[PDB]
Amino acid sequence: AANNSEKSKALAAALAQIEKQFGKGSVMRMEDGVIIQAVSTGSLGLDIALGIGGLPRGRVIEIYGPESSGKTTLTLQSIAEMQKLGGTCAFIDAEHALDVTYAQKLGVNLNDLLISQPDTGEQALEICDALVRSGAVDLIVVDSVAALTPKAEIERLMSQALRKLTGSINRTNTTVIFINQIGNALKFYASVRLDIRRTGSIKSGDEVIGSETKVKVVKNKVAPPFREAHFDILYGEGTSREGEILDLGSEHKVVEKSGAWYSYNGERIGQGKDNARNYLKEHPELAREIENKVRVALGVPELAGG
Amino acid sequence: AANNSEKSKALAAALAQIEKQFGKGSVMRMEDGVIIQAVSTGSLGLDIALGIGGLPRGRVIEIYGPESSGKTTLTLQSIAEMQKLGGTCAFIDAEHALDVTYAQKLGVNLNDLLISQPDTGEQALEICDALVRSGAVDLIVVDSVAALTPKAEIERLMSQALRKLTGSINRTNTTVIFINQIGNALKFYASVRLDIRRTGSIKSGDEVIGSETKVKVVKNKVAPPFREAHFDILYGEGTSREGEILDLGSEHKVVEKSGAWYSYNGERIGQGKDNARNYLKEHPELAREIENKVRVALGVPELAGG
Amino acid sequence: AANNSEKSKALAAALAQIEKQFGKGSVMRMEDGVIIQAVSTGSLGLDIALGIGGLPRGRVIEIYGPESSGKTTLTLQSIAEMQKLGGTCAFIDAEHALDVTYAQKLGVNLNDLLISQPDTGEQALEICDALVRSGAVDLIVVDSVAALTPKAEIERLMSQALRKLTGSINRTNTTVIFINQIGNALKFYASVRLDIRRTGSIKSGDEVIGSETKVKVVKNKVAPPFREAHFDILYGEGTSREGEILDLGSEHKVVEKSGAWYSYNGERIGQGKDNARNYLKEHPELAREIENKVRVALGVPELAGG
Amino acid sequence: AANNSEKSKALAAALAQIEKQFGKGSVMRMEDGVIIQAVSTGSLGLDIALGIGGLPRGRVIEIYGPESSGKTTLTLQSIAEMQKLGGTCAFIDAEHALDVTYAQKLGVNLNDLLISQPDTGEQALEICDALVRSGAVDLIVVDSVAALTPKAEIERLMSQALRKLTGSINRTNTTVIFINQIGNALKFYASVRLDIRRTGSIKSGDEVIGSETKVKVVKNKVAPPFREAHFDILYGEGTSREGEILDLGSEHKVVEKSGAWYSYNGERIGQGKDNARNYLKEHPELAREIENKVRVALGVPELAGG
Amino acid sequence: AANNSEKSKALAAALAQIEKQFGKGSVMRMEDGVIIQAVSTGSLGLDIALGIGGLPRGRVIEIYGPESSGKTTLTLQSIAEMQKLGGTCAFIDAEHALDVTYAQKLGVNLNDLLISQPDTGEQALEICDALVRSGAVDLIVVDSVAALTPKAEIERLMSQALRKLTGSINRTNTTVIFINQIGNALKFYASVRLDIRRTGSIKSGDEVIGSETKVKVVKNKVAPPFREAHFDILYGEGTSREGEILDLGSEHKVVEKSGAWYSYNGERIGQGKDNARNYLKEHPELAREIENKVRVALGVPELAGG
Amino acid sequence: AANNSEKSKALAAALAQIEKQFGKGSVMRMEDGVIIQAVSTGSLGLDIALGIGGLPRGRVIEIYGPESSGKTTLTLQSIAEMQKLGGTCAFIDAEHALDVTYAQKLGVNLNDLLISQPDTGEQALEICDALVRSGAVDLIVVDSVAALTPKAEIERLMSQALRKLTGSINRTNTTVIFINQIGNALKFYASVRLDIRRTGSIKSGDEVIGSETKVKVVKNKVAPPFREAHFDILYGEGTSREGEILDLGSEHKVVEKSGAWYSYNGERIGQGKDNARNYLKEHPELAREIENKVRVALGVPELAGG
Ligand SMILES: Nc1ncnc2c1ncn2[C@@H]1O[C@H](COP(=O)(O)OP(=O)(O)OP(=O)(O)O)[C@@H](O)[C@H]1O
Ligand SMILES: Nc1ncnc2c1ncn2[C@@H]1O[C@H](COP(=O)(O)OP(=O)(O)OP(=O)(O)O)[C@@H](O)[C@H]1O
Ligand SMILES: Nc1ncnc2c1ncn2[C@@H]1O[C@H](COP(=O)(O)OP(=O)(O)OP(=O)(O)O)[C@@H](O)[C@H]1O
Ligand SMILES: Nc1ncnc2c1ncn2[C@@H]1O[C@H](COP(=O)(O)OP(=O)(O)OP(=O)(O)O)[C@@H](O)[C@H]1O
Ligand SMILES: Nc1ncnc2c1ncn2[C@@H]1O[C@H](COP(=O)(O)OP(=O)(O)OP(=O)(O)O)[C@@H](O)[C@H]1O
Ligand SMILES: Nc1ncnc2c1ncn2[C@@H]1O[C@H](COP(=O)(O)OP(=O)(O)OP(=O)(O)O)[C@@H](O)[C@H]1O
Ligand SMILES: [Ca+2]
Ligand SMILES: [Ca+2]
Ligand SMILES: [Ca+2]
Ligand SMILES: [Ca+2]
Ligand SMILES: [Ca+2]
Ligand SMILES: [Ca+2]
């Protein structure tokens, strides 16, 4: 009774003192929402699972998973989203696999993309630090952890580098994403860790044209962890974000399914999911409007409209 | 003399204080007119009997009467009228008898009609409350009182629900109509109670094509009670409102009967009542113009023209 | 000399003060013309004798004379003229003698004619007052004075009624004509009093087809009194107005008689009076043009052309 | 030398000042031409002698001469010419000799001719004044001066009348011609005075069919005086104007005499004068064309062609 | 350790005392930058090699080198730059080779250029002194050392003159440049000595249109000596300064080479070096903006923008 | 050595004592400048030759020379200059030759000019004395010496008069100029004596439009004597002062000759001397600005600008 009031008073005061003393995000409740500066992953479901609506800026991010699970796709979409915000992006490459026609399809502006193919793991982290320290680079993607071979071996690395790097990152608000194939110092320094995997084939006839994808946020220091997103990745197209908008939009009653049609605000979008997705692809301002309504319904920060 | 002046002064001051203290409509004179936000019943005669020109918005309405007397017809017309105003409508159904071809003939837009077929009487009133609380539903029809069986029985309900519901209704201006076949808590919470019954057959040859209908306003908190309306309900067509317009229009000298013809503003409408009704059906803007003149002559608020 | 100037100055100033104090028309000179809103009697000669070109609107008119002298004819023509102006007319009948084929021949539109056959003299004047008070009736004919029997007798009337009626008439600009067969309160309230009588037969062979008619304006408050008009009334046709136009037109040099022909503006109208009258009947716009020239020559207001 | 220049400068300036001060026509040179609104006399030779091509409008004209010299003929032709211009004419007759078959032969439209046969000389001049004052009469012929007997005698007249009449004539542009048989006040008020006389017989066999006629302009205030015209007047036909056109036309080289033929513009008109005159009578538009060329050659204003 | 701190303390204090006692620039470190009032040489590379961004004002300058190496070009550009600053310039000529079409192409305003062709070496230095002493001449070019023949010979000079001249120069802030063909007193008095030579031909086909040029700063009292600049001199155009801006701009990452294009601030300048140079020639405010960014990157004072 | 120092010390002390004892101007060096209250002669060259920039105020001036050499011109210009200073002027005339259109062209305000034509030489000097003694006349011109005939002769004069007059002149600061045609007492009392003569014709075609003029200051007590001025006097225009400004201005480097143009402060004045003179005439404030710079360069006091 007064026991319960006394107990809730004490919990609140402790939670507040913990946040003051150890920093925001140090203790959360598992289903907490958010009251934030983020860059979209290009997946609405993943932006929602992240709680703040995207990857947090000025932080270290790790994305790991088996090859062809969607890691590079997610980072190229993040680059395209950051470029849309007006930000400058760099790709530090130790894998030599980038396909720039694909990057372009995902919205990356290659004219403005910085690229580095470093001579060693040391050199990769030092170049990464130099770009962070410039104060003029907004997002860096490092591909990939394992490939970051020490000079001695070519003829604790991660750990001292990450110490130096995180120092720089905190001063300049640069976002840095490491792609890791499936390293340990990363586990503590990262504010967000994503576990991505293929969960099924998508097929046209017996031609596979894509993959069902699951991403789990296994570490999240800016909103509660362990949320998941499920979306399609289509060959040549990346995340089917328009599909997410229709699915989540209909689920949360923003978008109507009227017989065979998807409709929004009393107007038809398309007959069947493929037609409706294509219409949203052709009408990106409408797509963004609907997306933002879905974000608001779920308590997730909006993206830029306009 | 001065006795009479003193007496009239005292009556007026008491009536004014009663209205201030107990609310408008608490004491009226039986033939009072009105100085109001209403939705039409689809019957001109009933809108006139209601005094304010329709059902009052933000209030509870009860419509009761024997089966096939016209209750569902009146509520579907009210839905069509509310949709014409731009309002969102819901039908909460415990009778499983709705005919949507008929609803469409009466002008209901099924695309925009919310529908619920609840699992119990409790569930019906809770869903009704949730829709009222949304602030986004303008009119709810609940069919029907008796059918609202308590969960325990399936395996005071009305009374506590109506307490909660009327609280919500007053905050959001939602209109809620209960259809009752021939419950007690309704008698006090309802601002308007309608008693509807069939009073005769309408025939083509020996084929009955409709029914003469009488509606009595047995409770009216927004204008004086106990007025009545008489109109035809035709199978497949609902209230013969064009017939009411010609009848009341001619009665109150707005519409002329010139020999065999009905005429308005010096122009023929049709030869005989059937032809004139059909012409008004084909010329709804004229029908509304004449209807509104009749309303004005009787001291009843107008509907939207245009 | 200066005596004459002083005397004319004094007369003028008195006449002006009398008009200001007692109202226009209170003192006139017997051959005064006019500087007016009127409705034609259907007789050009009578419209001229009235000075203002017709009966004055917003006033009481009395027309009296022996039966079959032309009273009803004059009032039906006045109705037809008022309807031509767009005005609404009523006939209050205590004589039960109206012939509506004749009324139609005289140009009355029966569709728009209000009719009343009152239960008593009181009822006649009360209905007359109600029509005046509507503000929507332009001309009322009351037939006839003597027939207006008091209720008590059926089982001062005129006088108190005329007091009330003239009050209403002055507010609404309604014209009211009383037909009187040959009452006293009428003598003062009437602005115009007409004395009409038959003065001779008109014959085809030994078949009488009409009557020579004399109307004397015995009271005139809107222009000088005691002028007279002489015209034919033909069975089935009313006043021979085309005959008046030719006669007065030729008299005042507007219309030419060239040998056997009547001519206007250098063009033949017809050979002999009957042919010329028929031509004007067939060419009413020409008839009106010539009529208006005659009115202008005599200092009488014009009618509508077009 | 400079004497001559100084003298011509002074003369011109005086002539200009005289015209400004005393009016146009006050001083002229005897052979002056003209730079005018006129009505033809029906004689080309006389229209030329008048300088302005006809009698001046808005002026008083006197025509005097022995009986049968051609006075009435000239005035009837002037009437016919004025009617051709669209003007309204009046004949004020104290002689009782008019032959209207002759007037018609000369082109007078009797339908439009006003006629007066006054009771006295006074009455004649007063009617003349009233017609002038109308502003609607273009030409008045008064026949004849001597016959204008004073009332007293029947049981200075001309002089006070002419004062009043000339006042009216100047305001309204009416032309007034007085025929005088062979009065003194006329000598000064008239702008033009014509002296007409027979100078010889015209014969067919020993049948006289006409008369050689001489007209002298003894007073002319609109162009120089004392010019003369000589022409034939034929019984029943008036002035032989076609003969004048051929004579003056050939004299001034407009018309050719080719052997026995008269020709104009390279085309034969007729063999011998009689045939050529008749052809011009039958072809009045050609006659007018040739007449106007002759007028132009002589510096005389043209008539209407068409 | 503390040995090193003690040693660095002592060096700094000595360097500071040397500067105070012998003057700024007396001891420098070879790669020192600068913390200055300068006039541009018209070569960005040479302005950079000079450290302060141009020739120092209020000082003596020597420029020496073989004929046609670019000496006169550099001094005419310095004149044009000084005139751009609003300064008054003089050219003292003992060589008689000036081409003023070329001077104009290089931006010299001939209207404001003072010119002297002295009678002897003595007279040249005395006129130079008089111009310096005026306090109204900002830059003097003396062409050329060897040609400055003593009067006695025409029928130590430099040394006593330079003593007097440097006294005047220090009081008035006049800049004086001596052109020397390849004198000894100059070696000590000069604050800056430039060694310029042709190092190669520039060709269009087999037509030589210019020369590769090297300038070495062999003496520099205002910033460290022995730096070098390499640039093109084109016949008729002088130093290719726009070429320097593109080269140094791209080298120091201010200007982008994107495929075949040079670009700055995200906007194309031109396809290939010639087109980009011409664009900068046509857009001098942009050229200056880019030049100044390059200066800032290298630690060199800026020029006036605007 | 010390001989030279002793000698220069002695000279200076003697010169200083001579000035104290005999008055300023008693001993000068021939090329001395000046350290003064003056009125301009209207000639810049003459104002410069006078050393103090004009005639000295409060002194006697003699101007002598052959007729038409420019004496009257110089005195009328002096009057115009004195009036410009706000001073009151008088002209005492024994020659009767003054042309006041010319005086006006030279800038004399005739409204304010006092004039006297005395009866004798005695009377002239007595009136001159009375005007001086008023304390209210600033400049008096006496024309002319020879014409100043003694009364006895009409039926030593100069000498006793000049004694009295110079006494008055010294008290009141009046300037008095005597014009003398080519008297002895004048030679000593005058502070300034001018010898003016024509030295050549100025011609347009073979029309002489003016005269080259030389003025020598043969006596000067306020600055060194014997300086000369040469200027044009143009018929109707007086001294060509704008021409002097351009000539002396260009000579002393204030005004530029740039090709065919005269220019000042970088702005064109006119193409050729005539155009430049006219521009300065139209822009008197500029003319004065340039004139004053020339005066300052020569060590001569300035005139009022503004
Ligand atoms: N160049 C490309 N063109 C078209 N689609 C591509 C391309 N690369 C990848 N994809 C799509 O994205 C899916 C995952 O590829 P992605 O490179 O994003 O994963 P990854 O984990 O970075 O791969 P890896 O480990 O092989 O370097 C692929 O299965 C394919 O459907
Ligand atoms: N589906 C329909 N099609 C055509 N006409 C109908 C239909 N339903 C009702 N009507 C007309 O309206 C009349 C009354 O029906 P309505 O359903 O409005 O009354 P109710 O009181 O709600 O009925 P119940 O009590 O049977 O559910 C009927 O007699 C019929 O004439
Ligand atoms: N029904 C009719 N048809 C044709 N002509 C008619 C008719 N009624 C009247 N007239 C003509 O008009 C004349 C006068 O009739 P009117 O009714 O105008 O006079 P009244 O004074 O109103 O008559 P009463 O006193 O008989 O009611 C008649 O003599 C007749 O020539
Ligand atoms: N009625 C006529 N019919 C034919 N020709 C006529 C007629 N009247 C006149 N003429 C011709 O005109 C000539 C002159 O007649 P006119 O009447 O013009 O002269 P007048 O001076 O007015 O005559 P009077 O003085 O006789 O009244 C006659 O000689 C005749 O040739
Ligand atoms: N009059 C000119 N027109 C065009 N280009 C010129 C001209 N003079 C010089 N140049 C260009 O500049 C280069 C060097 O000439 P400049 O006179 O600047 O050198 P310099 O050392 O002063 O010459 P010199 O020693 O011959 O007097 C030439 O090779 C030529 O390309
Ligand atoms: N009235 C005038 N109009 C125009 N120019 C004149 C006039 N008077 C003099 N000048 C110009 O000035 C010149 C000298 O005249 P000015 O009268 O100044 O000399 P002066 O020595 O006083 O003459 P004088 O001895 O004849 O009285 C003349 O040659 C003429 O060019
Ligand atoms: Ca809808
Ligand atoms: Ca009607
Ligand atoms: Ca006619
Ligand atoms: Ca770019
Ligand atoms: Ca004054
Ligand atoms: Ca210049």
Author numbering:
A (entry chain A), B (entry chain A), C (entry chain A), D (entry chain A), E (entry chain A), F (entry chain A): 6 to 40, 44 to 163, 176 to 202, 219 to 342
List passages from the publication reporting this PDB structure.
RecA protein catalyzes strand exchange reaction between single-strand DNA (ssDNA) and homologous double-strand DNA (dsDNA) molecules, and also induces the expression of DNA repair proteins in response to DNA damage through a regulatory network known as the SOS response. In the present study, we report a functional and structural characterization of a RecA protein from Herbaspirillum seropedicae SmR1 (HsRecA), an endophytic bacterium capable of fixing nitrogen under ammonium and oxygen limiting conditions. As seen in RecA protein structures from other bacterial species, the tertiary structure of HsRecA can be subdivided into three domains: a small N-terminal domain (NTD), a central core ATPase domain, and a large C-terminal domain (CTD). The HsRecA protein forms filaments on ssDNA, and promotes ATP hydrolysis and DNA strand exchange as do other bacterial RecA proteins.
We solved the X-ray crystal structure of H. seropedicae RecA to 1.7 Å resolution. The crystals contained a single HsRecA monomer per asymmetric unit. Electron density maps derived from molecular replacement phasing permitted assembly of a model of the 351-residue HsRecA protein, with the exception of loops for which density was not observed (residues 1–5, 41–43, 164–175, 201–218, and 343–351). The core domain (residues 44–275) consists of a conserved α/β ATPase motif, which in its turn contains the Walker A (residues 72–81) and B (residues 147–157) motifs, and the disordered DNA binding loops L1 (residues 163–176) and L2 (residues 202–219) for which electron density was not observed in our structure. A Ca2+ ion is bound by Asn119 and Asp120 in the ATPase core. The co-crystallized adenosine diphosphate (ADP) interacts directly with Ser76, Ser77, Thr80, Thr81, Asp107, Tyr110, and Gly272 in the HsRecA structure. We observed an extra electron density beyond the β-phosphate of ADP which could not be properly modeled with waters, SO43- or PO43- ions. The refinement with ADP and ATP sharing the position improved the adjustment to the electron density and resulted in occupancies of 61% and 39%, respectively. The crystallography 61 symmetry leads to the formation of a helical filament that has a pitch of 91.3 Å, a value close to the pitch range 90–100 Å determined by electron microscopy for active filaments of EcRecA formed in the presence of DNA, ATP-γ-S or ATP. However the structural packing is that of the inactive state.
